[PDB]
Design a protein around this ligand. Structure first.
Ligand code: GDP
Ligand code: GDP
Lengths: 179, 159, 183
C-alpha cells in the first residue's frame, strides 16, 4: 500500500512486539536507528544483550532515557526509520525521576503526529490485570494507558502483537451501532 | 441491523468509557448514565439487575459506568456471585430498551497473591463471558481503538 | 489448504476465566476423535480443587483423562494417535509446576514447541496470556511471566492455528496474512 510515517506496536511482556517492530523496520529499505530507552540490574542487562545480539550491522543505536520527544524531532528524516525500544521503559524512567507524566506524554503524541521521517513506537499493554496495591504503580498503569491512547490517535497505523502474531487495528473503520 | 445491547471490554485507561459515551451521543436516543446536560444520572451499588429493568424504556439508552465496581460491592458484602451474575445476564436479554455495559479485562496478568483479588479476577472473567453471551454486540477497546468481535461468526477448526 | 481441512495443532490463548477451556472443549467435541484431556492442574489447595471440579463437571463421559503435571512433551509424544484428539488442560499450570519444582523453563518450553511439529495425532494447547499487567514485585513472578510469553510465541509459531479468546468469544489470528507496511 501507500507509505506511512508512524506505526504503534502494542503488546504484553515478552509478546514478540520488539522482534515484530525490528522485522517491519528491516523490510523498509531505510537507514535503521534504534532509539534505546532502557536503563541498565541483571534483568535489564539480559534484555538489552538479547536485543543487541539479534541486531546486525545495519542498525545505529542512539540513547534517549528521558529526552525521547526531542530525540525523535532531531533524528527523524525520510531517509531513516527510527524504532523506539520501549515507550514503557521511557515512561518508567520519568516516573521514578519524579516527572509529571502528562506533559511529556502530550508532547510525544504531538511529535508523533508531525513526524517528517518514519518511526515505529513499541509499547506495552499494562492495563489488563488487577488494580495495583501501591499508588505509584496505579499512576504508572493509568499514564501508560493514557499514553497508548494518545499515540494510537497520532499514529498512521496501530498493530496489537499477541504471542508473536501481529494484528492491524488501524487503519480500520470504527464499528457503528444502531439501537 | 439495530441491537438492544452492547458489551465494551478493555483494560485500565483503554478509552472504553469515552467510547461507550460517544456511541450513545451518535444514537439519536435519550442518553442516561448508571453509576455503581443531555444525560440523567442514577445510582445502583447493589440492585443493578432490578435497577436496569425499572429505568430502561424504548426511548432511553442506558450506559452502565462499571460492571467492575458493582461486582466489587457484592464481593465486599460476602455475596455468592454466581446467582446475581446469572440474573444480570438474563436481565440483559429482556430490557424494555437498549443498554451499553462498560467492563474491564482484569485476567491478562499474573495470579494475584491475595484471596480477594483472585476471587474478583475470577468473578470479573465469568461476568464478562455471561454478558458477552447475552448481549447482541461486543467490542474490545485497546489504546482507544474499538474492534467488534460480536456479531461475527466465531472461528471453527476441524481435526 | 481450505480452512475446513483437518489441522494438526491449535493454540487457544486467553486471560484467566476467559472461556478458553470451553472453546477448546467445543472444538474437540465437534470432532469424531477419541477425546483425551491431558491434565496439568495439581489440587494444591481448595481454589485449585474447585477449578478441577468445574472442568470435570463440564466434560461428558466421551472424555478420557491422563495426568502430566511435569512430563507434558513426553506424554503428548506417547499418547497422540491419529484417532485421538489431545487437549492440554493448561500450558500455564504445567509451567507453574516446573517453576515450583525448580526446573530450568527454557529447555522444556523449546522441546514442547518442537514436539507440536511432529505428533502422530492432533492436539489443542490451552494457555494463559499473563503479560498485559504491570511488572511483578518478586523475581519468580517476573521469571514466570517472561517464560510464559516466550512459550506462547513458540507454540503460536509451531501450531497450524491460533485463537485469542476474550470474554468467552474466540477470534482467529492464525492462519491469516501478517500486516505489511511501507515507510
Ligand atoms: N525487572 C524488569 N524486567 C523487565 C522490564 N521490562 C522488560 N523486562 C524484561 O524483558 C522481558 C520482555 O522482553 P522483550 O524482548 O522486551 O519482550 P517483547 O518485545 O514483548 O517480546 C520481560 O518478560 C522481562 O523479563 C522491567 O521494567 N523490569
Ligand atoms: N489459586 C489459583 N487459582 C487459579 C490458578 N489458575 C487458575 N485458577 C483459578 O481458575 C480460574 C480459571 O478457570 P478456567 O476454567 O481455567 O478459566 P478459562 O479456561 O480461562 O475460562 C481463575 O480465575 C482462578 O480462579 C492458580 O494457579 N492458582
Amino acid at each position: 500500500g501507500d507509505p506511512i510515517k508512524s506505526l504503534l506496536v502494542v503488546g504484553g511482556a515478552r509478546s514478540g512486539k520488539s522482534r515484530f517492530a525490528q522485522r517491519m523496520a528491516e523490510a523498509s529499505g531505510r537507514s535503521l536507528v534504534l532509539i534505546a530507552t532502557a536503563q541498565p540490574d541483571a534483568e535489564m542487562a539480559d534484555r538489552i544483550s538479547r536485543h543487541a545480539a539479534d541486531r546486525d550491522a545495519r542498525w545505529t543505536l542512539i540513547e534517549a532515557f528521558f529526552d525521547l520527544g526531542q530525540t525523535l524531532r532531531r533524528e527523524a528524516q525520510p531517509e531513516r526509520l527510527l524504532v523506539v525500544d520501549s515507550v514503557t521503559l521511557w515512561l518508567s524512567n520519568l516516573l521514578l525521576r519524579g516527572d509529571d507524566l502528562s506533559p511529556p506524554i502530550k508532547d510525544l503524541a504531538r511529535t508523533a503526529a508531525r513526524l517528517e521521517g518514519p518511526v515505529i513506537f513499541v509499547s506495552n499493554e499494562v492495563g489488563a490485570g488487577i488494580v495495583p496495591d501501591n499508588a505509584l504503580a496505579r499512576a504508572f498503569r493509568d499514564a501508560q494507558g493514557m499514553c497508548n491512547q494518545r499515540l494510537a490517535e497520532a499514529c498512521d497505523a496501530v498493530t496489537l502483537v499477541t504471542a508473536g502474531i501481529a494484528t492491524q487495528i488501524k487503519p480500520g473503520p470504527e464499528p457503528v451501532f444502531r439501537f
